[PDB]
Every structure is written in structure tokens, then in C-alpha cells.
Design a protein around this nucleic acid. Structure first.
Ligand SMILES: [K+]
Ligand SMILES: [K+]
Ligand SMILES: [K+]
Ligand SMILES: [K+]
Ligand SMILES: [K+]
Ligand SMILES: [K+]
Ligand SMILES: [K+]
Ligand SMILES: [K+]
Ligand SMILES: [K+]
Ligand SMILES: [K+]
Ligand SMILES: [Mg+2]
Ligand SMILES: [Mg+2]
Ligand SMILES: [Mg+2]
Ligand SMILES: [Mg+2]
Ligand SMILES: [Mg+2]
Ligand SMILES: [Mg+2]
Ligand SMILES: [Mg+2]
Ligand SMILES: [Mg+2]
Ligand SMILES: [Mg+2]
Ligand SMILES: [Mg+2]
Ligand SMILES: [Mg+2]
Ligand SMILES: [Mg+2]
Ligand SMILES: [Mg+2]
Ligand code: NA
Lengths: 158, 178, 186
RNA sequence: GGCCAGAACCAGCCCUACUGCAUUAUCCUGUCGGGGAUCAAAAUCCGGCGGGCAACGAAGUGCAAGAAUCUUGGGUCUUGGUGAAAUGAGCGGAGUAUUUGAGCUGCGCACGGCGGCCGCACGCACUGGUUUCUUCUCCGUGAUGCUCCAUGUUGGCGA
RNA sequence: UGCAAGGCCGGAAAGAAAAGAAUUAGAGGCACCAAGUGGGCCUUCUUCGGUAAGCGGAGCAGGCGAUGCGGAAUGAACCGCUUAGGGAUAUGUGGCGUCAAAACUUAUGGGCUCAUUCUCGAUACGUGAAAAGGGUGUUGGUGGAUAAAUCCACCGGCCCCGAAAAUGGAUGACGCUUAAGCCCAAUUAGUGAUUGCCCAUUAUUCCUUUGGUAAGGGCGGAAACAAAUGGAGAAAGUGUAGCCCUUCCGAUGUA
RNA sequence: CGACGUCGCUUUUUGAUCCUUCGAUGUCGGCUCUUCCUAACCUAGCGCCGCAGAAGACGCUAAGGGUUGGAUUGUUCACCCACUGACAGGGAACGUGAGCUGGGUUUAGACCGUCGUGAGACAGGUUGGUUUUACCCUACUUAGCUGGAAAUUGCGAGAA
């Protein structure tokens, strides 16, 4: 019956997309991974060397150690009543830089720029207004919404 | 008794966005017990017709339409109802009533009685006051007679609730237990 | 429902129709007839000056409306019976065994029906007169006479129904007592 | 009397009465033309056109905050009392006023036609004015009482 | 002077703006020592094997077990609600012809239905009783046709036929048919607005108990004050007849 | 009457399942005896027939009544002989063992055949092989005694 090997039930998981087959590209090689960075662990099916387990596909974590051809990532895994910090070792081809903190970093930089503008006395950008406020609506065209006899005939096939 | 359905005119639209800066404004005719049901029916119609969801639209008005002065009239109600085996069945009926809301409520009761149809499976297409000479059904046309009269027979006349009794003398009005 | 449904009948000069509580009585020459229609619940009016009998149904469906013409036909039958009466002529038809019918006062005895030894006896009510036509004019003919159509018939049928062929082909063995002519007496 | 019952009043509850604001127009009228049906009509019905509040027990439509104090509602054998600290718009002193709504109004500003003019149902500021009718407002009592218990009335029954 | 790492010294900090721009009956962590469990069973959906099975096997989550209470007459598990011990007042599911509380059979609501020996129907779950097929029963649609209104096909609704088992029997019993049946809609009825009524171990509130991850006050006798003829007590306190007072919240339960 | 299709019903058949019972609910047949069902064999009506008569077929309402004697076999069944108007089908813990009987099944003795090295095994054959208890409570069947309308009481008062 069902077996329990390392790669059981990965027929659609460890498969390349349609017309997107091939080994990793040059930009994947040239990417710099540092300790403390956030990375997504997505297995590249074409490499097959250093592939993570099927559980860690799609999980993101922080790299804890960098190695000539490998990367070690701390991934949270819930077992029973607590989550463990599993340190998995993969090849560099199975990790992508994570944009999870992109919005937070942009918010920090926006705050710093706003403080700089306030200190320098430059005029601040106008504040946004909610769309949930009231107002007078002047309609360009007003239509009548009603059910017609033809709708049932249209919905009835043959 | 006054009708259980009220005439609502629900005016609404989609919330303006960058793709639709000036959305179309739709007016809707509904007969509903309250304005919450009126708005629910309006948004159902907008979703199934104009592909507009209630979460992405707004309502400019949900007012009620006052009834005209009470006059014995003929009301043509074009209505439709859904059944599982029969699909959508559309019919046109004539009613004798004094108001549009009264005629539509009478139509809803008639559909429930004769076809086992509930409020949420019924869509009123139109209601209008038609002349005497355009009435097709004889059951409605029999009330157009200039001299129409009839006696009240087989009437179970009940006493006033304060004067009702359990035991009454046989040929007198004296109450023994009351 | 239909607010008003009517049926109107014309009363001849001799006969007078009287209605009271859905109980009709037609009195004229040759006798008097009475019918109890209290099970019908209709509005029965008689205009004596115009000699009309009207039966009305108010707010009636098809089932209640169906009784208007039945009541009109019943009253017409009573008028016709009071005026001219009813006469039913039945004939004894046989292949081999003659059917001997003897008529006493209000009593009919049938013998030798298909050779049977059993005698069939029928008692006729005093409101219906039974006679036997002499064989010189027409063979084996029995005449029922009376004002009530429902009473003149039934008698002609209890006579037909008592002489029924049993345990035999009825395509063959066609003998019996059959009503040939229904007519009046005046 | 530490019993039974009834009426009073307090306080707190819990029920009821008493209603204002906003809406309406597919509406309400009149009058013409049609159209309809009649013995003739009228009406149902549909167009113009002129008005407009169906009008507050108009509407069964939205929301209501109206001191049961004026103006002795009811209930509490569903609470505790009988003033052993009554905190009261309720007591007790003063005063005839006070401000707060509704009218009606000023100026600027928002707001609405239409492209700086017109409107403005009366928003906002001047806590603007007016006072025409609508309301009462203002003061007052620590515990030198740590805690608990202890204070009516009218009968019936108990000498 | 670049990177990488470990520091150090500054700087700034809506302590996270505005755009619908969170919420919390949110003290986070961290040990130690143990007990019962380790036959489970029911559903809603998803699902596999099997003709199925009150059959066997899974998924997610609830529930019985372990648990009463109010309701479906009766029923482990369905509906409502979950349980200190008492009151009042409200409800929920379910009801308001009698049994049986409540329409003393409500309306000044609209239609539909007549069912002769398992005797129409009326409680979801619970085919915890039924189809294929038929009806010139009645009353509603839809499309034609013809001209005093007809008749032709076609779809509903309720009723009827299909529809046979063994003790006498089960809408629940009686009964009901101007329903006490069915579909819809009211709340005193075109009068003037927006809560008919009746039933919980539920809600709200009141009283008492008990226990807190409980919250507070007071505790240096305040001055006075015999009897005959206001009184008592006041403990620096886990647990008592609990030191006293005030306040809040919880309270069922098999192993 | 009826393909091949299609929808049922039944629980007199086997199967499936494992819910009850393993500190025990007497296990086949027969006999006796009552009762119930109807999907009606006879018997009462009545339709229809390819229904002349006679004899039937098919259906309808109806379960009031009836439904036998034997040969072989433990049999239920089966089959045959014979009578009859007819010799219908079933249910009641596969009705009925403190009712019987015990032929069968299913101990221990023994024989055969086949199987086993054997002791032994057979859903194969054969022969021989303890059927306990009511005096209890109901239920039935008869047999006595005796109060009671506020069904014992109120004095609580209703005359076919
Ligand atoms: K009292
Ligand atoms: K429960
Ligand atoms: K009704
Ligand atoms: K306590
Ligand atoms: K202590
Ligand atoms: K036996
Ligand atoms: K051997
Ligand atoms: K043997
Ligand atoms: K033997
Ligand atoms: K033996
Ligand atoms: Mg165990
Ligand atoms: Mg109550
Ligand atoms: Mg009662
Ligand atoms: Mg203490
Ligand atoms: Mg406990
Ligand atoms: Mg035993
Ligand atoms: Mg036994
Ligand atoms: Mg019998
Ligand atoms: Mg047996
Ligand atoms: Mg026995
Ligand atoms: Mg025995
Ligand atoms: Mg033996
Ligand atoms: Mg007595
Ligand atoms: Na994939």
C-alpha cells in the first residue's frame, strides 16, 4: 500500500511547471545569502542534490549558517503541543530571498523620509481621505434595474 | 387588513474606482416586508444582472413609495416563480384590489396557495392598474357590471369579544356561562 | 368562483310551482308532485306573474354549479309528469321459452323465464299503475303509467333486472324484459 | 407580644400611560384631449397643461432622548424600611429669576444652481441678535459612628 | 577606504501617521512529581469497500461517553439550553379544540383540499413507508387554433388509483373538515404605526451560600458614660462559631 | 401473455452483519391444540373471455366456513396410491420438550471405507446408547365469600 519514503506523494509537488523546465539560472547563482536573512525554501526539481523534505517546500525562515554550496535555515514546525525550530540543510538552489518584510522596511524608510522632510521644513504630501464619507452624487446616466421576460428564455438552453 | 408587503424604490450603484469613476446609477422596484429585505433583493438583482456585489457598491436611497388613494381597481401583476422540476415559470394574473402593494401581496398569497411558492423564489416583473375593458379573466371581469349585487349567505357571524359566551339559552340571547 | 349563476324555466299555464325551504311542489291537473331538495343549498325563486322558476348559485365552483341544471331538469320533469304523465312500455323478448307475465293489482309475476321453475314477484307502488297490453295488439307488453318519472322508471328497471341471464353467454341468450318506448299518457 | 391581618407613607427597583423630529410627488387636485362603459352617463384607464401639504387620530415609513414632578398610574406575601448618619429635579433653606429649545433675524464662511453671480431649507463662527412662548435655579449637612443589633399605625388573638 | 563577523560610539524614534488601516473576560515564559486513559461510540459535510445493512474503514469539526434541564408523545447522540439554592421578570426550541399552560376554538387575513374496514391529512431528524406509471376529481399557469364562446396539445397544486401479513391498535388519545388539514401572512386589524399569549436548571435582576490568580477599608480602644432602672463585640488574621466591614467574579461533572 | 428494458413489494429462502444473550433464553421432525394473515384451493355474490352448451381461462368484493386416508423416508421436503366440493399458501421465539415423543442430530462402546508414521480424523456409512422440577406469581378454566355512586369518606342534595 502507501509507503513512507523520503519522496512519497510528491508527484505534483516536485514537478516543474508547464514550459518552465530547466536547471536554475545564473541570477540564482549570483544571489547573495547571509546569516540572518529571510528565505523561502522552494525545492527545485531539476537539481535533486540537497533538496529539502516535502514538508519544507513553501516554508520561509531565517538562515543560520552559510556554506560553500549549502544554506542552513531555521524553519518552525508544529509537532504536538509546541513548534520546534528545525535547522535544515539545503543547497543554495532551493532557497529564494524572502520579501516578507518588504512592506515593513518600506514603512520604516517612509517614516525616516517623512521625519527628514519635517525637520527640513519641506511641505508634506497631502493626507489621504476615506472613501466611506458622504457626499452628493450627480449621476451621468440613471438606469432601471429590473427582471425581464427575455432573461428566463436566455438562461433556458435549447 | 393592510398589505404585508411595502413598495420600495431602491436606488444604488457600484462604488466608484479608478476603472469606473462615474458608475451607472440603478433604480429598483421591490415589494418587501422591510427595507433590509428591500436592500437584500436590490443587491441580489445587481449581482445577478450587473455583476456588482454589495461589498463593492453603495445605496443612494431605500425609500418607500406611498400608495394612491383607495379605489377599486384591476391590477395586472406579471410575476415569476422557481420550481425544481418546472424551472422558472412566468405568469400574468389579474387581481381586484385597492392598492399596488395590496395586489402584489394578494399575488404572493395566491402563488403560495396554488403553487407552493415562497417569497424568495418569486420575482415580481411588473404591476400596473389596467382598465376594465382590458381584463381577460372572467373571474375578474364579473366585477365590472354597473349594477352588481349579491347577498351574504353562509356567514359565521361571531359576537363581540367582550360579549361572547360559552353557554347561551336555546332561543334567547341570555348567556348562562360567559 | 362565480358571483352569480342562474337557470330559468318557464312554467306552463295549468301548472303552479311552489318553493319553500328548497322543497318544491308542482300542482296542476292530473295530480301533484313534491321533491325534497334540501341537500342542494341553492336559491329557488318563483315568479308567478311571469310564470318563471329560477335557481341561483352565489359564489359557486364547478361542483356547486353543476346542480343548477339538475334542479332545473328535476322541476321540468315534475311539470311534465303533472301535465302529461309518463308511460313506459316494456316488452318480453325470448328465443325458445315464452316468458309468462301475469299482472294482478300492483303485482307482477314472471314465470318460465328461460324455462326456470322459479317465479319472480314484483310489487309496484300505488303511485305507479301497471297494466298488460292484450296480445292481439302487441305481444307480451307491460305498460307502467305515472306522474313521477323516477317512479315510472325504476319499476321498468326492477322488472328488467330481475330477469337477467346467469352463468350463460349474454351475446347469445338475449331474452329478457326490455324497455322499448318511453312516452307520456296525455 | 418575638403572633396574625389591614391600611399609611419612605428608598430602590419593575411595569405601564403621555411624542417629537425627518420623510412623501409612481402622490394630491383642477382642467383639456383621448379612451371607455352606459338609456344617458359617471368611473376604472391613458396623455398634455395649471396648481399643490391627501397633513399630524395624514401615512400602519425612518428615528425618537416625551423627569409617573408638575398632573396623589399600577406592582412589590418578588426588596429593605418607619429615619439609629433621609444627599433628593425628590429633603431643607433662599430667589423670581436662570438658560435652552422653538420662532424670527445679522455678518462672514461652508453648502447648492450656473458660469462671480444667483440661491440657501436656515450647517459653522461670532458660545451673534431678538424675547414672541417653552422651561423653575441656587445654595446646604463627614464618619468625634471600627462593627453588629436596637425606634411606626389600626384591628384580631393572647390577662 | 570594499565585503564578512564580533563589538564599541553616536543619531532618530508617526514607539508606529493618513488611507475602512484590527481585536482581545491577552500576566508571558519555565520546571518538578504523579494519576487515570490507551475496547470508544454518534452525527453535518468529505470519503473508500460492499446490493445493501441499526455493515465495515478513513478526513475535518462538533456531540454522547461523563450530563442533567426545557422541546420533538416515547428514543444515548436530534432541537433549544448547557447545571451553587431560592424569588421576580423576560425569553429559546416547541406550542395556544380537550387531554394540557396558552387564540374562553384570535382577526374586523388570502387561497387550496373531501380522502368507504392498515379507515385523507396533520413532528424535521425519522423510506421511524413507498415509487415507475395513471386520473373526463377539482383549480391554477403556458403556447396554439377557431368563432357564441369554444377546443388542442403542454406544465403546476391538492386529492384519488397504483398500494398485499400474519394478537386488537395507534397523526398521540379523542376528535377535527365555515379544520383542530395544507401553503402563505398577521397581532387585535385600510383607526390613526412599528412587544397577542404560554411553557426552561437559559437571559436580566434581587436575596443567601460557597470558593477565588480575588479587590478594598478598619484594627495607637474617641470623648464621655455605676446600680436600683441603648446593648454588645473589635483577634495584624491560610484554614474556626470564619477578626470585623465593603466590593467583584465563578459555582454541573465519569475515571 | 409478452420479450428487453424499467419501477416495485414481501420476509414462508439463503446470504451479509454481529446489536442481545456464553455465573446457559432446552437445538430437527412429528403429535396435540388454539389463534391470526391473505398473495382465495373449495364454498357466497359479480365482471370479462378467442363466452354456443358442457367444461374452463382471466379478474373483482370477500378469510364467515372448510381444506382428508394412506405406501417409502427420522425427515421438512419429495414421490406414489386413493377419496373429495376442495384436498390453498403462510405467521404466531423457523408457535407449541416443568405438553409428549426422542426416529434424526450431537459424548463416552464398537465396525467399515478413505486419510494419517502414529495417537487419531472424516462436513462418509453403521450399530448401541438416563428427556429432572410447579405447592410461587400471573394467564386461562371452573368453584365460593363479600363490600361498594365522594367507587370505603361529605352531612357533596342531579329519578329515562
Ligand atoms: K398589607
Ligand atoms: K446535552
Ligand atoms: K382561512
Ligand atoms: K465571600
Ligand atoms: K488564622
Ligand atoms: K420440539
Ligand atoms: K495405513
Ligand atoms: K464417524
Ligand atoms: K443411532
Ligand atoms: K457413535
Ligand atoms: Mg482496556
Ligand atoms: Mg414567568
Ligand atoms: Mg387550557
Ligand atoms: Mg475573618
Ligand atoms: Mg464540582
Ligand atoms: Mg434455564
Ligand atoms: Mg424458556
Ligand atoms: Mg377464521
Ligand atoms: Mg421452533
Ligand atoms: Mg413450553
Ligand atoms: Mg423436557
Ligand atoms: Mg437416538
Ligand atoms: Mg360514600
Ligand atoms: Na506543482
Amino acid at each position: 500500500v502507501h509507503s513512507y519514503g523520503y519522496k512519497s506523494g510528491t508527484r505534483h509537488l516536485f514537478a516543474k511547471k508547464f514550459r518552465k523546465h530547466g536547471v536554475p539560472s545564473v541570477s540564482t547563482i549570483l544571489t547573495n545569502i547571509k546569516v540572518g536573512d529571510y528565505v523561502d525554501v522552494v525545492a527545485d526539481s531539476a537539481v535533486r542534490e540537497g533538496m529539502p523534505h516535502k514538508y519544507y517546500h513553501g516554508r520561509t525562515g531565517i538562515v543560520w549558517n552559510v556554506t560553500p554550496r549549502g544554506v542552513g535555515v531555521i524553519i518552525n514546525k508544529p509537532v504536538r503541543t509546541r513548534t520546534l525550530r528545525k535547522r535544515i540543510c539545503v543547497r543554495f538552489e532551493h532557497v529564494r530571498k524572502s520579501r516578507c518584510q518588504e512592506a515593513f522596511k518600506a514603512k520604516e524608510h517612509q517614516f525616516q523620509a517623512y521625519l527628514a522632510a519635517k525637520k527640513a521644513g519641506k511641505a508634506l504630501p497631502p493626507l489621504q481621505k476615506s472613501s466611506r464619507l458622504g457626499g452628493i452624487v450627480r449621476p451621468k446616466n440613471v438606469e432601471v434595474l429590473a427582471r425581464r421576460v427575455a432573461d428566463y428564455e436566455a438562461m433556458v438552453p435549447y | 387588513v393592510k398589505p404585508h408587503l411595502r413598495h420600495y424604490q431602491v436606488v444604488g450603484r457600484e462604488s466608484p474606482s479608478e476603472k469606473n469613476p462615474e458608475p451607472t446609477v440603478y433604480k429598483f422596484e421591490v415589494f418587501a416586508p422591510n427595507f433590509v429585505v428591500a436592500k437584500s433583493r436590490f443587491w441580489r438583482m445587481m449581482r445577478v444582472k450587473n455583476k456588482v456585489k454589495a461589498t463593492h457598491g453603495d445605496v443612494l436611497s431605500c425609500k418607500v413609495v406611498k400608495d394612491a388613494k383607495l379605489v377599486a381597481r384591476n391590477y395586472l401583476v406579471d410575476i415569476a416563480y422557481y420550481s425544481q422540476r418546472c424551472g422558472y415559470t412566468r405568469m400574468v394574473k389579474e387581481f381586484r384590489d385597492v392598492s399596488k402593494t395590496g395586489a402584489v401581496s394578494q399575488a404572493y398569497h395566491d402563488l403560495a396557495s396554488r403553487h407552493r411558492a415562497r417569497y424568495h423564489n418569486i420575482e415580481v416583473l411588473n404591476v400596473k392598474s389596467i382598465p376594465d375593458h382590458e381584463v381577460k379573466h372572467l373571474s375578474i371581469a364579473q366585477y365590472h357590471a354597473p349594477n352588481l349585487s349579491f347577498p351574504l349567505l353562509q356567514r359565521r357571524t361571531k359576537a363581540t369579544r367582550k360579549d361572547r359566551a360559552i353557554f347561551v339559552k336555546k332561543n334567547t340571547k341570555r348567556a348562562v356561562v360567559a | 368562483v362565480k358571483v352569480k349563476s342562474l337557470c330559468t324555466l318557464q312554467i306552463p299555464e295549468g301548472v303552479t310551482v311552489d318553493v319553500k325551504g328548497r322543497k318544491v311542489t308542482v300542482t296542476g291537473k292530473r295530480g301533484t308532485l313534491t321533491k325534497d331538495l334540501t341537500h342542494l343549498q341553492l336559491d329557488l325563486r318563483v315568479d308567478k306573474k311571469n310564470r318563471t322558476f329560477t335557481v341561483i348559485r352565489w359564489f359557486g365552483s364547478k361542483i356547486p354549479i353543476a346542480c343548477l341544471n339538475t334542479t332545473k331538469a328535476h322541476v321540468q320533469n315534475m311539470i311534465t309528469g303533472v301535465t302529461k304523465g309518463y308511460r313506459f312500455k316494456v316488452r318480453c323478448a325470448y328465443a325458445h321459452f315464452p316468458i309468462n307475465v301475469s299482472v294482478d293489482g300492483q303485482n307482477i309475476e314472471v314465470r318460465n323465464f328461460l324455462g326456470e321453475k322459479r317465479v319472480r314477484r314484483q310489487l309496484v307502488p300505488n303511485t305507479v299503475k301497471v297494466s298488460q297490453t292484450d296480445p292481439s295488439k302487441v305481444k307480451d307488453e307491460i305498460v307502467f303509467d305515472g306522474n313521477d318519472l323516477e317512479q315510472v322508471s325504476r319499476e321498468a328497471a326492477v322488472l328488467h333486472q330481475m330477469c337477467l341471464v346467469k352463468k350463460k353467454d349474454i351475446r347469445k341468450f338475449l331474452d329478457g324484459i326490455y324497455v322499448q318506448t318511453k312516452t307520456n299518457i296525455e
